[PDB]
Design a protein around this ligand. Structure first.
Ligand SMILES: *SC[C@H](NC(=O)CC[C@H](N)C(=O)O)C(=O)NCC(=O)O
Ligand SMILES: *SC[C@H](NC(=O)CC[C@H](N)C(=O)O)C(=O)NCC(=O)O
Ligand SMILES: *SC[C@H](NC(=O)CC[C@H](N)C(=O)O)C(=O)NCC(=O)O
Ligand SMILES: *SC[C@H](NC(=O)CC[C@H](N)C(=O)O)C(=O)NCC(=O)O
Ligand SMILES: *SC[C@H](NC(=O)CC[C@H](N)C(=O)O)C(=O)NCC(=O)O
Ligand SMILES: *SC[C@H](NC(=O)CC[C@H](N)C(=O)O)C(=O)NCC(=O)O
Ligand SMILES: N[C@@H](CCC(=O)N[C@@H](CS)C(=O)NCC(=O)O)C(=O)O
Ligand SMILES: N[C@@H](CCC(=O)N[C@@H](CS)C(=O)NCC(=O)O)C(=O)O
Lengths: 215, 215
């Protein structure tokens, strides 16, 4: 059974969890708690990883790090990355545009100056969201009728920015619908209600925004 | 003929240029100068881009943004991304590990506190480089005998960190060799000597590190 290792937080790996659950894939997790740095450090170089880091994904011979390599691998095994170079590039474009939002948050979330930095981020956020709002015209998911991994990435990004500004989707009804559509996927509905769902923190526990043991 | 648009800097797009040149692909560039923000802003929404941004790559019907989508697209058209999910994931892992170095620089390069932040980055850099040093044991390129896009990404990262600390590869002879190997690829040798090579800046011109009109 594959092993997905990360801090017991949403962070970089939450879209991967959602994708695995969507696919009904069997996996176990190594979940490092806030005080378990020592535990991670004692395993870091003992797992066969060529590029030791968190998250990791171990699947027989396959030992992977890099969150994006991992999510894309799971997707790839299910024939989800795209049917030709142009569609693969389209999906990678969606992926990167989501990361501009999600990393946009993480870039500032650990700063002493988060509250001032938040102003600048929220000023740019509507422009980024509008691109997705436009993309969703006449589409159920970002690539139309079928789910792709960026859908779970975008889902996670929306979850996160809504904590930062609960009104940030008020101008984007299609994105509001989209978030509900993901939540309506029966596998996702079940997961979000399950003992396996990690609601919080959004970032590493030490973050100024999206950190701490509880919201 | 495809169009690659970016600021006239190395920045996010330099590995893409190197890959195109390696492949002997025909392309033209839209190169925005330091004072040409207005020019970019007047084109940004007039190019058919679904996710307007820099860089962009326009190839007939195909209008792409996201630097990583673009480099991977060029690679994909040349059957370079990997022969199966595991190899594709391996290549995406290399890609992400390079980005930890290259984005590691960009994260701090625009800060007023760059000089203090540099200490922390240079403290972590040897650990990141060692993973690549180990990977290159008995290999010509990162994936062995054949070039892949992360080779050009790593090349660009080494170029950049050597400006920050010219001694940072003193402990990593295989990486030193690697950088020279890339420079010895005849297409790359020619490109680096050509009028098309943009030597500087490394970052946006306004950066504290790797900015300005000249080094
Ligand atoms: S991957 C094969 C090509 N399809 C697409 O590019 C799909 C585009 C959208 N992502 C979608 O509609 O889902 C292909 O061969 N298309 C036929 C063509 O017009 O050439
Ligand atoms: S999908 C966005 C546009 N449609 C609408 O606004 C119709 C009203 C719907 N209730 C809604 O989606 O808001 C649209 O079709 N834009 C593209 C076009 O060709 O006009
Ligand atoms: S949210 C689902 C989409 N409807 C609208 O955008 C209308 C929004 C209302 N005007 C509002 O709440 O303000 C939609 O068109 N969905 C169709 C689809 O194929 O996704
Ligand atoms: S993509 C097909 C598989 N090959 C690899 O994974 C290549 C691994 C390295 N990147 C390399 O050697 O270049 C494959 O089918 N391998 C055969 C097997 O052992 O199953
Ligand atoms: S590739 C690194 C190891 N080889 C050497 O150190 C031999 C000397 C060479 N001049 C050099 O590469 O430095 C090596 O083989 N490590 C793996 C192993 O199986 O020992
Ligand atoms: S740099 C090329 C590799 N040689 C070494 O690592 C030895 C380095 C010296 N000890 C030194 O300069 O300090 C190498 O083994 N290359 C073979 C390959 O297949 O790449
Ligand atoms: N580019 C990497 C970044 C990984 C990373 O920064 N991981 C942090 C957690 S968010 C960590 O704790 N890494 C463990 C380590 O470096 O030992 C990825 O996307 O996986
Ligand atoms: N995730 C994007 C980031 C792109 C980006 O930040 N581009 C900057 C230059 S480094 C820019 O000037 N963008 C133009 C714009 O936003 O209008 C990518 O990798 O392409």
């Amino acid at each position: 059974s594959p092993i997905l290792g990360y801090w017991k937080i949403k962070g970089l790996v939450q879209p991967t969890r959602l994708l695995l659950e969507y696919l009904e894939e069997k996996y176990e997790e190594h979940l490092y708690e806030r005080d378990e740095g020592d535990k991670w450090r004692n395993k870091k170089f003992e797992l066969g990883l060529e590029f030791p880091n968190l998250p990791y994904y171990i699947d027989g011979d396959v030992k992977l790090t890099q969150s994006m390599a991992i999510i894309r691998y799971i997707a790839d095994k299910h024939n989800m990355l795209g049917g030709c170079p142009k569609e693969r590039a389209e999906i990678s474009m969606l992926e990167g545009a989501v990361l501009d939002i999600r990393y946009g948050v993480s870039r500032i979330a650990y700063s002493k100056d988060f509250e001032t930095l938040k102003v600048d981020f929220l000023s740019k956020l509507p422009e980024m969201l509008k691109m997705f709002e436009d993309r969703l015209c006449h589409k159920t998911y970002l690539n139309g009728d079928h789910v792709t991994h960026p859908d779970f990435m975008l889902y996670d990004a929306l979850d996160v920015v809504l904590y930062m500004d609960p009104m940030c989707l008020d101008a984007f009804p299609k994105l509001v619908c989209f978030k509900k559509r993901i939540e309506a996927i029966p596998q996702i509905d079940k997961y979000l209600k399950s003992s396996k769902y990690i609601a919080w923190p959004l970032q590493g526990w030490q973050a100024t925004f999206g950190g701490g043991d509880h919201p």
